[PDB]
A paper describes a structure:
Residues 297–391 (using the numbering of the longest human brain [name] isoform) constitute the proteolytically stable core of paired helical filaments (PHFs) from the brains of individuals with Alzheimer’s disease. Here we use time-resolved cryogenic electron microscopy to study the in vitro assembly of recombinant truncated [name] (amino acid residues 297–391) into paired helical filaments of Alzheimer’s disease or into filaments of chronic traumatic encephalopathy. At later time points, the first intermediate amyloid disappears and we observe many different intermediate amyloid filaments, with structures that depend on the reaction conditions. At the end of both assembly reactions, most intermediate amyloids disappear and filaments with the same ordered cores as those from human brains remain.
Cryo-EM structure determination revealed the presence of the same filament at 120 min in the PHF and CTE reactions. As we observed no evidence of earlier filaments, and because this filament adopted a cross-β packing characteristic of amyloids, we termed it the [name]. Although filamentous, the [name] does not generate fluorescence with ThT. The [name] adopts a pseudo-21 helical symmetry and has an atypically large, left-handed twist of −6.3° (other known [name] filaments, including those described in this paper have twists between −1.65° and −0.77°). The ordered core of the [name] comprises only residues 302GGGSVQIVYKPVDLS316 from two antiparallel [name] molecules, with a predominantly hydrophobic close-packed interface. At its centre, the side chains of valine 306 and isoleucine 308 from opposite protofilaments pack against each other and are flanked by the side chain of tyrosine 310. Whereas the β-sheets in the crystal are flat and stabilized by additional crystal contacts, β-sheets in the [name] are twisted and stabilized by additional hydrogen bonds between the hydroxyl group of tyrosine 310 to the backbone groups of glycine 303 and serine 305. At 120 min, 100% of the filaments that yield interpretable two-dimensional class averages are FIAs, but they are no longer observed at 160 min. In the first intermediate, the [name], only 15 residues of each [name] molecule are ordered; the remaining 80 residues are not resolved in the cryo-EM map, suggesting that they remain largely unstructured.
Residue numbers in the entry:
A (entry chain F), B (entry chain G), C (entry chain H), D (entry chain E), E (entry chain O), F (entry chain P), ...: 302 to 316
The structure:
Amino acid sequence: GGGSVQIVYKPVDLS
Amino acid sequence: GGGSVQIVYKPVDLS
Amino acid sequence: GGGSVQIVYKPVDLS
Amino acid sequence: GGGSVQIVYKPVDLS
Amino acid sequence: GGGSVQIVYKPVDLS
Amino acid sequence: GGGSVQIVYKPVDLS
Amino acid sequence: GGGSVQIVYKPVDLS
Amino acid sequence: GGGSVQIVYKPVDLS
Amino acid sequence: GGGSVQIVYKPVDLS
Amino acid sequence: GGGSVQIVYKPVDLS
Amino acid sequence: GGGSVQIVYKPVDLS
Amino acid sequence: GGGSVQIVYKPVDLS
Amino acid sequence: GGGSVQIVYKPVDLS
Amino acid sequence: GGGSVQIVYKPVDLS
Amino acid sequence: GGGSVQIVYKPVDLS
Amino acid sequence: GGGSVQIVYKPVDLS
């Protein structure tokens, strides 16, 4: 098994 | 198995 | 097997 | 097992 | 603008 | 604008 | 098990 | 601009 | 178990 | 501008 | 068990 | 500009 | 400029 | 236990 | 410029 | 200039 990449991406735009 | 990429992408737009 | 890409994409638009 | 990369990315834009 | 995800995925099988 | 996902996917099979 | 990299990344832009 | 994720993913399977 | 790298990265931009 | 994440991921599987 | 590296990185830009 | 994260990830599996 | 994080991650699994 | 490294890094840039 | 973090992480697993 | 942090991390697991 060649490993793992996990990404949680949650940009928030205000005003 | 050549590895793995997982992405959770949840942009939120407010006002 | 050449690995894997998994994406969950859930944009939310508010007000 | 080829290790693991985990990223939480939450940019915030204000005013 | 809720950001961007860009992915280049080029699996190679040899021999 | 709910962001953007862009993927370039080019698997190669040799020999 | 080849270890682990964990990143929490939260840039803040104000005014 | 809500930031950016860029990924280059090039798994190689040999012999 | 090949150890562990943990990073908290929170850059802040003012004025 | 909410920063940037760049990843180069190149697992190699041998014998 | 190969230990641990923990980093808290919080650069501040003013004026 | 909210900084930058760069990762080079190259797991190797042998025998 | 909000600084920089650079990581080179190369786990090696043998025998 | 292979020990521990902990780093708190907070550069502040003024004028 | 808010400084810099550079990490070279190379865990090795034997026998 | 906000300085620099450089880390070389090479844990070795045997028997």
